[PDB]
Design a binder for this molecule. Structure first.
Ligand SMILES: [Mg+2]
Ligand SMILES: [Mg+2]
Ligand SMILES: [Mg+2]
Ligand SMILES: [Mg+2]
Ligand SMILES: [Mg+2]
Ligand SMILES: [Mg+2]
Ligand SMILES: [Mg+2]
Ligand SMILES: [Mg+2]
Ligand SMILES: [Mg+2]
Ligand SMILES: [Mg+2]
Ligand SMILES: [Mg+2]
Ligand SMILES: [Mg+2]
Ligand SMILES: [Mg+2]
Ligand SMILES: [Mg+2]
Ligand SMILES: [Mg+2]
Ligand SMILES: [Mg+2]
Ligand SMILES: [Mg+2]
Ligand SMILES: [Mg+2]
Ligand SMILES: [Mg+2]
Ligand SMILES: [Mg+2]
Ligand SMILES: [Mg+2]
Ligand SMILES: [Mg+2]
Ligand SMILES: [Mg+2]
Ligand SMILES: [Mg+2]
Ligand SMILES: [Mg+2]
Ligand SMILES: [Mg+2]
Ligand SMILES: [Mg+2]
Ligand SMILES: [Mg+2]
Ligand SMILES: [Mg+2]
Ligand SMILES: [Mg+2]
Ligand SMILES: [Mg+2]
Ligand SMILES: [Mg+2]
Ligand SMILES: [Mg+2]
Ligand SMILES: [Mg+2]
Ligand SMILES: [Mg+2]
Ligand SMILES: [Mg+2]
Ligand SMILES: [Mg+2]
Ligand SMILES: [Mg+2]
Ligand SMILES: [Mg+2]
Ligand SMILES: [Mg+2]
Ligand SMILES: [Mg+2]
Ligand SMILES: [Mg+2]
Ligand SMILES: [Mg+2]
Ligand SMILES: [Mg+2]
Ligand SMILES: [Mg+2]
Ligand SMILES: [Mg+2]
Lengths: 79, 136, 94
RNA sequence: GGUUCUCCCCGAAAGCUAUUUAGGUAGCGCCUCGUGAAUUCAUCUCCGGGGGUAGAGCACUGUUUCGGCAAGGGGGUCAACCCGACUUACCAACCCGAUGCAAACUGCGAAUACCGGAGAAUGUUAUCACGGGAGACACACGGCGGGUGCUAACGUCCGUCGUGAAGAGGGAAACAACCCAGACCGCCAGCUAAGGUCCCAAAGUCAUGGUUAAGUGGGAAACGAUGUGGGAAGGCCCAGACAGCCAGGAUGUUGGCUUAGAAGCAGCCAUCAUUUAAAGAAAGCGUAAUAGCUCACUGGUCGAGUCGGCCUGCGCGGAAGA
RNA sequence: UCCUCCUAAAGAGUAACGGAGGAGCACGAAGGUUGGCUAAUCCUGGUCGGACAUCAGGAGGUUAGUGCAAUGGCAUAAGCC
RNA sequence: GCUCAACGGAUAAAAGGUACUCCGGGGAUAACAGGCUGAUACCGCCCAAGAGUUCAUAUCGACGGCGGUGUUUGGCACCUCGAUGUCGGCUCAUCACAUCCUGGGGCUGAAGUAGGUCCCAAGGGUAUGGCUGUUCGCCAUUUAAAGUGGUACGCGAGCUG
RNA sequence: UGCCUGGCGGCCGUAGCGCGGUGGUCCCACCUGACCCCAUGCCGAACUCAGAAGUGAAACGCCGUAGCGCCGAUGGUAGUGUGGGGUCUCCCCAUGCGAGAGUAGGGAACUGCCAGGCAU
């Protein structure tokens, strides 16, 4: 017989994009869950404790790449 | 036998050797032996072929071994059950794709090169073929 | 000297290229200058015979396409990975 | 383990979580019935967004080869005791120029998968919510991307679809997982798919051009050999291509040798030089060794086809079990 | 028991007695605000002082750093006063 | 106020043997067998550094590779736990040919007698005793040999233990 | 209306480095000195508060340079969603989607507000 190590693992946190862009959201709705600030907060977008982007106003979610470093920003178009 | 001096990890997945070759032309010497089939060459086979070609040419030139064994192949010990972790590392192989150049040389004449590669190819499972460098 | 009687490629694509290669031919491209690139279809054996000569990649070549002779140079060539075959050839218009 | 009369309609699972739990149970995922509900849901077309998996690459993290720049060492050829003249079938930091590999590498990057917005057409609302009732948490095979194993198992573990489970028929001899195709009933009706049309066994001994001589068809590899057609490309050409055969085939020279006599059949080196009309101190060779023959190299007869390397289909040997 | 990477097939999730590592804490400051600041490495000169410190200049731009293992981020700095 | 860490935690409070065992079940799950694969096992073949006075093939053959059988050791748990008795010994044989002898040939580093290797060929034959329960093996003496395997590692509704 | 300068933005790797030398009548920088009121955990190295003696020397900005970094076609290749196949550890065809790298080439940024100084 024998024994083997490294048999441990961790539970997934279900990260990723939730609204996927182009959807109609409400105030306080969570858009993306992530560890690091891969997507930065834009217009009417707040940053959570764990870098979660929540919309502060109902409207449309838009993905764009702005900034000097070509960073992705989430924008809330209040149409 | 040649193998990497150190690696980040000891064990690797089996993987699949599908696709085409990357280095398909001789860029160092003038004559080359290149694999035409598909398989996995081992360090022992590479060393045997290198020794055969070296003793055939009497080291009257240069030899280039394009491929390098870097994939650790592990086998479980005999008479043991399934599971209980992954088997210990056994040897090292190099994934081979069709059209990839295996050995390169120069200086020696065409007859000597073809008579040396002819006996150096029998030490490898994968069928090989002889080519000469061209202008692009 | 190195004259190649070419034609005009009717359809382009992976399937068209495979059919051309199976029909003892191979596609090629002539680009450069200001004129639009021209896709041509060449016979395999005759071009394979000239490829052995070292002058093919050094001196100018004449391509006759529907009677219009064009001076081109063998810019780049793609060959079969493990077979004496020609996949695709580029020609700079000069 | 067993659970007894009939018919009609609908109809799954062997999955997740927890469990002194793993062959039980509870909730959910899946099923049935009833009540309500919105263009609710599904297919297709257009539009917006996320990728970071194939593939590709070495800008980063690891690995690796040959070159230049180099410090140079290790048996020196040579002194043979020298500074070592010098490279001694060796190794050798960065820097540049190329060549590869990576599930825990990505300066890049698809198809598909998934969400949302708009639109026609179709589908017995197929969609959602609640309540009554269950059943079930032993799955297997094949296709696809994989871990593990030996890219071994009718082996095992994951994700999608199909199949059976819960499914009759036709085809592959039989053969749940392959292919075609979804059995309301009855027919001495026709058509077709898989699959065939010489007889078992039903329908081409059909038509048009080729390959096969092995019964290949109707088991298998590395390799090997003028089987046989095809495709080009080569060289030798009436200035006579190749094999018969008629013949020559020399000297200084029994070449320094090494010895065994060595003169080619024991040897490192030599096949230097007269005529070369032609002319190998000779490749075979009997042999104590020569003393002999032949061929290499040629010109005497011929008289139209040859010489050997690739891309190709079939075929041959490797092929030995009760 | 919990967390990080891959297998995990470019949304989420996804198994094995698979491959690799950690966690059962610390901090009244290691938190809040304001103001200010930008390394690792290497080269040159210089008294001890050295393959190494403390200094002055230059090459380089995050190849440093995160209280911790790993992943994703940090220049407006999440890095340092 | 609980390393209830067996961490969705039985109770504040818990170790072993049974071959003296028994009950309900499983081939859902093992041991002997049969099936599947062949890592390992046996055998065959491919190229050639050489050994062999020079000389690679008369005999071998390193560094390497490709295969056949199921044939030992191995993996799965697919039939069997509402029963398939497995070691060895006696009698009884069949089949395979990868042939021990006999039979017919090739090569030979085959002078002869007597040898090495390879091909075809299964028609026939192919030990007696001491040791230990033997298979295996050692020894003593013969023969041409006392050949290798499968048959539920053959055969206990043919026999012992 | 045209020259260049300043401030705020869009666009954030054809928008950035290297080389050549120009700019001051304006604006900016260098700079003078500093008890204040402020400052260095030491120094006006940085903030500043009082200004114009000089300079464009460093910067800043502008014009050309193909030495770089980059943007990168057409064609070809790899991959594949569906269906159908072979000799099935992998590959073929009918179909659409079609990469990465490397060629041809492009290239020494455009553009919106006011705020002045210039000729008109
Ligand atoms: Mg296609
Ligand atoms: Mg139904
Ligand atoms: Mg139970
Ligand atoms: Mg209902
Ligand atoms: Mg996916
Ligand atoms: Mg219900
Ligand atoms: Mg219910
Ligand atoms: Mg369960
Ligand atoms: Mg259960
Ligand atoms: Mg069951
Ligand atoms: Mg299952
Ligand atoms: Mg499956
Ligand atoms: Mg599979
Ligand atoms: Mg399998
Ligand atoms: Mg099972
Ligand atoms: Mg059942
Ligand atoms: Mg059926
Ligand atoms: Mg059937
Ligand atoms: Mg009919
Ligand atoms: Mg028909
Ligand atoms: Mg048909
Ligand atoms: Mg058919
Ligand atoms: Mg048929
Ligand atoms: Mg027929
Ligand atoms: Mg009939
Ligand atoms: Mg055949
Ligand atoms: Mg055969
Ligand atoms: Mg995912
Ligand atoms: Mg701050
Ligand atoms: Mg308590
Ligand atoms: Mg418990
Ligand atoms: Mg019992
Ligand atoms: Mg069963
Ligand atoms: Mg068994
Ligand atoms: Mg059985
Ligand atoms: Mg020898
Ligand atoms: Mg027998
Ligand atoms: Mg025989
Ligand atoms: Mg008999
Ligand atoms: Mg007879
Ligand atoms: Mg027996
Ligand atoms: Mg019986
Ligand atoms: Mg200046
Ligand atoms: Mg293209
Ligand atoms: Mg491209
Ligand atoms: Mg490009």
């Amino acid at each position: 017989g024998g024994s083997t190590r490294n048999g441990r693992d961790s539970e997934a946190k279900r990260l990723g994009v939730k609204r996927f862009g182009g959807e109609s959201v409400l105030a306080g709705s969570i858009i993306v869950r992530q560890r690091g600030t891969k997507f930065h907060a834009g217009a009417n977008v707040g940053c959570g404790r764990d870098h979660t982007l929540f919309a502060k106003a109902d409207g449309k979610v838009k993905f764009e790449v702005k900034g000097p470093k070509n960073r992705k920003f989430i924008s809330i178009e209040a149409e | 036998m040649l193998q990497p001096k150190r690696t980040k990890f000891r064990k690797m997945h089996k993987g699949r050797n599908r696709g085409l070759a990357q280095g398909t032309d001789v860029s160092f010497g003038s004559f080359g032996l290149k694999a035409v089939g598909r398989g996995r060459l081992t360090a022992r086979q590479i060393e045997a072929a290198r020794r055969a070609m070296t003793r055939a040419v009497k080291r009257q030139g240069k030899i280039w071994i394009r491929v390098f064994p870097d994939k650790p192949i592990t086998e479980k010990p005999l008479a043991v059950r399934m599971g209980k972790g992954k088997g210990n590392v056994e040897y090292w192989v190099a994934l081979i794709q069709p059209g990839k150049v295996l050995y390169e040389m120069d200086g020696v004449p065409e007859e000597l090169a073809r008579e040396a590669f002819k006996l150096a190819a029998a030490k490898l499972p994968i069928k090989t073929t002889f080519v000469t460098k061209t202008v692009m | 000297m190195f004259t190649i009687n070419a034609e005009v490629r009717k359809e382009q694509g992976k399937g068209a290229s495979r059919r051309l290669r199976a029909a003892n031919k191979f596609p090629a491209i002539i680009y450069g200058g200001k004129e639009a690139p021209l896709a041509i279809e060449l016979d395999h054996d005759k071009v394979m015979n000239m490829q052995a000569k070292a002058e093919f990649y050094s001196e100018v070549l004449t391509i006759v396409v529907d009677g219009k002779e064009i001076k081109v140079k063998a810019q780049d060539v793609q060959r079969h990975p493990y077979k004496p075959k020609l996949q695709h050839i580029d020609f700079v218009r000069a």
